[PDB]
Design an enzyme around this catalytic site. Structure first.
Site, mmCIF file in Angstrom:
data_model
loop_
_atom_site.group_PDB
_atom_site.id
_atom_site.type_symbol
_atom_site.label_atom_id
_atom_site.label_comp_id
_atom_site.label_asym_id
_atom_site.label_seq_id
_atom_site.Cartn_x
_atom_site.Cartn_y
_atom_site.Cartn_z
ATOM 1 N N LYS A 89 0.872 -1.166 0.000
ATOM 2 C CA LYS A 89 0.000 0.000 0.000
ATOM 3 C C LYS A 89 0.910 1.216 0.000
ATOM 4 O O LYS A 89 1.874 1.276 0.760
ATOM 5 C CB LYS A 89 -0.888 0.026 1.244
ATOM 6 C CG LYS A 89 -1.752 1.278 1.352
ATOM 7 C CD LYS A 89 -2.732 1.160 2.502
ATOM 8 C CE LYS A 89 -3.619 2.386 2.618
ATOM 9 N NZ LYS A 89 -4.638 2.186 3.682
ATOM 10 N N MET A 124 -2.390 -12.309 0.476
ATOM 11 C CA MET A 124 -3.507 -13.242 0.583
ATOM 12 C C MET A 124 -3.946 -13.484 -0.855
ATOM 13 O O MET A 124 -4.559 -12.624 -1.485
ATOM 14 C CB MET A 124 -4.632 -12.625 1.411
ATOM 15 C CG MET A 124 -4.222 -12.337 2.847
ATOM 16 S SD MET A 124 -3.744 -13.837 3.755
ATOM 17 C CE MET A 124 -5.337 -14.552 4.036
ATOM 18 N N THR A 125 -3.620 -14.665 -1.367
ATOM 19 C CA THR A 125 -3.893 -15.019 -2.752
ATOM 20 C C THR A 125 -5.282 -14.841 -3.355
ATOM 21 O O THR A 125 -5.385 -14.527 -4.541
ATOM 22 C CB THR A 125 -3.422 -16.462 -3.042
ATOM 23 O OG1 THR A 125 -4.092 -17.378 -2.168
ATOM 24 C CG2 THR A 125 -1.930 -16.574 -2.814
ATOM 25 N N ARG A 169 -15.698 -6.813 2.988
ATOM 26 C CA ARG A 169 -14.784 -6.192 2.042
ATOM 27 C C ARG A 169 -13.426 -5.945 2.698
ATOM 28 O O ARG A 169 -12.420 -5.788 2.007
ATOM 29 C CB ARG A 169 -15.356 -4.865 1.527
ATOM 30 C CG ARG A 169 -15.557 -3.813 2.611
ATOM 31 C CD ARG A 169 -15.926 -2.454 2.024
ATOM 32 N NE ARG A 169 -16.138 -1.446 3.068
ATOM 33 C CZ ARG A 169 -17.322 -1.134 3.594
ATOM 34 N NH1 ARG A 169 -18.425 -1.741 3.173
ATOM 35 N NH2 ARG A 169 -17.398 -0.225 4.559
ATOM 36 N N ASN A 170 -13.396 -5.924 4.030
ATOM 37 C CA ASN A 170 -12.150 -5.679 4.751
ATOM 38 C C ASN A 170 -11.481 -6.940 5.296
ATOM 39 O O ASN A 170 -10.581 -6.865 6.129
ATOM 40 C CB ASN A 170 -12.387 -4.661 5.879
ATOM 41 C CG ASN A 170 -12.603 -3.244 5.352
ATOM 42 O OD1 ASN A 170 -13.407 -2.481 5.903
ATOM 43 N ND2 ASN A 170 -11.874 -2.879 4.296
HETATM 44 C C1 LIG Z 1 -3.111 -6.499 2.643
HETATM 45 C C2 LIG Z 1 -3.169 -7.630 1.642
HETATM 46 C C3 LIG Z 1 -3.942 -7.732 0.488
HETATM 47 C C4 LIG Z 1 -3.625 -8.982 -0.068
HETATM 48 N N1 LIG Z 1 -4.200 -9.546 -1.278
HETATM 49 C C5 LIG Z 1 -5.046 -9.074 -2.247
HETATM 50 C C6 LIG Z 1 -5.303 -9.911 -3.382
HETATM 51 C C7 LIG Z 1 -6.216 -9.392 -4.412
HETATM 52 N N2 LIG Z 1 -6.533 -10.146 -5.600
HETATM 53 C C8 LIG Z 1 -7.200 -9.570 -6.896
HETATM 54 C C9 LIG Z 1 -8.176 -10.479 -7.650
HETATM 55 N N3 LIG Z 1 -7.654 -11.871 -7.847
HETATM 56 C C10 LIG Z 1 -8.655 -12.721 -8.600
HETATM 57 C C11 LIG Z 1 -7.214 -12.479 -6.570
HETATM 58 C C12 LIG Z 1 -6.177 -11.635 -5.756
HETATM 59 N N4 LIG Z 1 -6.771 -8.156 -4.232
HETATM 60 C C13 LIG Z 1 -6.474 -7.442 -3.157
HETATM 61 S S1 LIG Z 1 -7.227 -5.810 -2.940
HETATM 62 C C14 LIG Z 1 -6.601 -5.106 -1.488
HETATM 63 C C15 LIG Z 1 -5.290 -4.662 -1.481
HETATM 64 C C16 LIG Z 1 -4.722 -4.119 -0.262
HETATM 65 C C17 LIG Z 1 -5.530 -4.042 0.902
HETATM 66 N N5 LIG Z 1 -4.945 -3.515 2.104
HETATM 67 C C18 LIG Z 1 -3.714 -3.026 2.439
HETATM 68 O O1 LIG Z 1 -2.749 -2.955 1.681
HETATM 69 C C19 LIG Z 1 -3.591 -2.581 3.897
HETATM 70 C C20 LIG Z 1 -2.908 -3.490 4.994
HETATM 71 C C21 LIG Z 1 -2.435 -2.038 4.742
HETATM 72 C C22 LIG Z 1 -6.853 -4.494 0.862
HETATM 73 C C23 LIG Z 1 -7.403 -5.031 -0.342
HETATM 74 N N6 LIG Z 1 -5.650 -7.860 -2.206
HETATM 75 N N7 LIG Z 1 -2.674 -9.609 0.749
HETATM 76 N N8 LIG Z 1 -2.393 -8.790 1.792
#
Ligand SMILES: Cc1cc(Nc2cc(N3CCN(C)CC3)nc(Sc3ccc(NC(=O)C4CC4)cc3)n2)[nH]n1
Length: 287
Positions: free
Chosen positions: A45, A92-93, A141-142
Site C-alpha cells: 500500500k 492473501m492469494t 470487504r475488509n
Molecule cells: C493487505 C493484503 C492484500 C492482499 N491480497 C489481495 C489480493 C487481491 N486479488 C485480486 C483479484 N484476484 C482474482 C485475486 C487476488 N486483491 C487485493 S485488494 C486489497 C489490497 C490491499 C488491501 N490492504 C492493504 O494494503 C492494507 C494493509 C495495509 C486491501 C485489499 N488484495 N494480501 N495482503
C-alpha cells in the site's frame, strides 16, 4: 550494538518489486509486489505524492506494528522515512472476502466453510477485544482470503487502542451506515461493542454469499428502522443458531451484545460439529 538509525520494521524500497495495482482502485494505491530477497509475493500500500492524508497513513502503519494474530493480516515491513511511503504485508492469494463470496463455487464454499470463516474472524476479534483495541471497520470487504479458506481481518486504518471504554470519532466524520451501530451513527460513539454489531452485519454478508445489507432500503431510513426494532431477516439456509447470534449482535444497547470471546466459543463449537458431520458424510463412500 546495532547501527544508530536501525529500525527493525524499515526496509529499502529497492528490496521490493512493484507490479500491478490490486482491488481495481477500490482500496486506494495498493499493488502486488515481490520481496526479492525471499522471492516472496507481498501486498504494498502506498501514498500518492502531495496527499493530505500522510498522517492517516503513518498511523495505520503504527497500529500494525502492535498487533499479531494468525487471523490478522501481518505487517512485514514499511518504508516511511522519506517520500514514497510503503506498507508491506503478507499476500492473501484470493483477495477480499466479499468478492470471494460473490464468485465462489458453493460446492466448495459450503455450510462448513461459512462457519469456518466466521470462526476465524471472531478469533481475531477476540484477540483485539482482549488487547482492548477496536477495529472500527469490520465488513467482508475488509477481510482477506488465502489458501484453504484461510481468512484474515485487514484494513486497520481506523483501528484504535482504547484508553477508556469508548471512543468518540471527530464530529463531521462519516461512516458506512449499513455496518454502523446506532450509538455510533447517533453520537459517534464506538467501542468493542460497536465492532460486535458490525460483526453481526458481516455474518449476514457471509450467510448471503455477499449480498449488500438492508436490500432495497434507503440509507436515510436505516436508523429510523433500527430504532423501531427492525432488523434484517434470517437468510435462506442460515442455521437458526447463527441467526440468533446475529440478532444478539444487533441488540440496541451495546451492553446487551455478546463479547467476542462468547461469539468465538459459539462458532468454534458449531464449526467443530458441522465439520465432523461433513467428514462422516464423506465416509459414507469410502471406509
Ligand atoms: C493487505 C493484503 C492484500 C492482499 N491480497 C489481495 C489480493 C487481491 N486479488 C485480486 C483479484 N484476484 C482474482 C485475486 C487476488 N486483491 C487485493 S485488494 C486489497 C489490497 C490491499 C488491501 N490492504 C492493504 O494494503 C492494507 C494493509 C495495509 C486491501 C485489499 N488484495 N494480501 N495482503
Amino acid at each position: 550494538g546495532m547501527s544508530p538509525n536501525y529500525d527493525k520494521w524499515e526496509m529499502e524500497r529497492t528490496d521490493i518489486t512493484m507490479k500491478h495495482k490490486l482491488g481495481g482502485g477500490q482500496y486506494g494505491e495498493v499493488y502486488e509486489g515481490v520481496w526479492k530477497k525471499y522471492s516472496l509475493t507481498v501486498a504494498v500500500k502506498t501514498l500518492k505524492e502531495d496527499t493530505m492524508e500522510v498522517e492517516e497513513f503513518l498511523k495505520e502503519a503504527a497500529v500494525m506494528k502492535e498487533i499479531k494474530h494468525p487471523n490478522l493480516v501481518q505487517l512485514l515491513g514499511v518504508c516511511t522515512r522519506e517520500p514514497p511511503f510503503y506498507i508491506i504485508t503478507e499476500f492473501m492469494t484470493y483477495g477480499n472476502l466479499l468478492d470471494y463470496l460473490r464468485e465462489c463455487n458453493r460446492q466448495e464454499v459450503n455450510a462448513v466453510v461459512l462457519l469456518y470463516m466466521a470462526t476465524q474472524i471472531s478469533s481475531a476479534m477476540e484477540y483485539l477485544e482482549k488487547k482492548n483495541f477496536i477495529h472500527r471497520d469490520l465488513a467482508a470487504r475488509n477481510c482477506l482470503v488465502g489458501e484453504n479458506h484461510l481468512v484474515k481481518v485487514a484494513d486497520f486504518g481506523l483501528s484504535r487502542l482504547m484508553t477508556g471504554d469508548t471512543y468518540t470519532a471527530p464530529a463531521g466524520a462519516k461512516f458506512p451506515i449499513k455496518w454502523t451501530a446506532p450509538e455510533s451513527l447517533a453520537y459517534n460513539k464506538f467501542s468493542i461493542k460497536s465492532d460486535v454489531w458490525a460483526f453481526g452485519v458481516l455474518l449476514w454478508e457471509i450467510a448471503t454469499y455477499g449480498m449488500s445489507p438492508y436490500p432495497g432500503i434507503d440509507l436515510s431510513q436505516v436508523y429510523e428502522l433500527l430504532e423501531k426494532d427492525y432488523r434484517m431477516e434470517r437468510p435462506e439456509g442460515c442455521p437458526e443458531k447463527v441467526y440468533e447470534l446475529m440478532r444478539a449482535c444487533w441488540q440496541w444497547n451495546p451492553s446487551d451484545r455478546p463479547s467476542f470471546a462468547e461469539i468465538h466459543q459459539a462458532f468454534e463449537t458449531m464449526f467443530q460439529e458441522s465439520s465432523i458431520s461433513d467428514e462422516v458424510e464423506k465416509e459414507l463412500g469410502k471406509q
